[PDB]
Homo-oligomer: A and B are copies of this chain.
């Protein structure tokens, strides 16, 4: 089931990738395309090279110039399209840690990376922040000042999950602290976009804190 792209705010589109996993069923994966006039920025690649191809087609069929992607942590559902973007000379970004994690796992690396706990993509359009470990040791979040959207990636859990998801790379006892660090930014959050599941409100943060503290206990 191929890639779906839908407008969720002015200049912000939710892109959703799917798999049919035999034995489980339908799973989805979210990222964003953020536009700045005709420039397009990808927050997380679709889950596969093929769906990453469809996302670029989506952009070029609309005449958008894809300027860069940013991936929120090293897992395959965040980075599967980095290699294809690299072959198209489209700058790809992760944090330094995510990049070095990919490199260690023998995966394609972004051509660019950022060193501090905060960075910007699109010259202020996208604010990135590392709040601490949770879902992974390297997970970062993206704040969109204009649309008032926090892309939480997998550090956040949508309202239809009651588990933290895959925790083999997780720091469960760190996670709730890391969400509080996001809370401390006092972002005027209108919408939180999780890496999987439905978009919700700032409520998603509290729901994630509950999940983490309960798992940590």
Contacts and interface: CB of A to CB of B under 8 A. Distances in A.
A165 B76 contact: no
Contacts of A47: 23
A28 to B, nearest CB: 7
A103 interface: no
B25 A166 contact: yes
Nearest to A195: B23
Contacts of A165: 22-25
Interface residues of A, number: 28
A75 interface: yes
A161 interface: yes
A23 B161 contact: yes
Contacts of A20: 166, 168
A27 B19 contact: no
Contact of A77 (B23, B29, B75, B167): B23
Contacts of A164: 25
Contact of A163 (B24, B77, B196): B24
A212 to B, nearest CB: 14
A186 to B, nearest CB: 28
A38 to B, nearest CB: 30
A165 B164 CA distance: 20
A216 to B, nearest CB: 16
Interface in A47-106: 47, 75-78
A21 B19 contact: yes
A82 to B, nearest CB: 13
Nearest to A167: B25
Interface string A166-190: 1110000000000000000000000
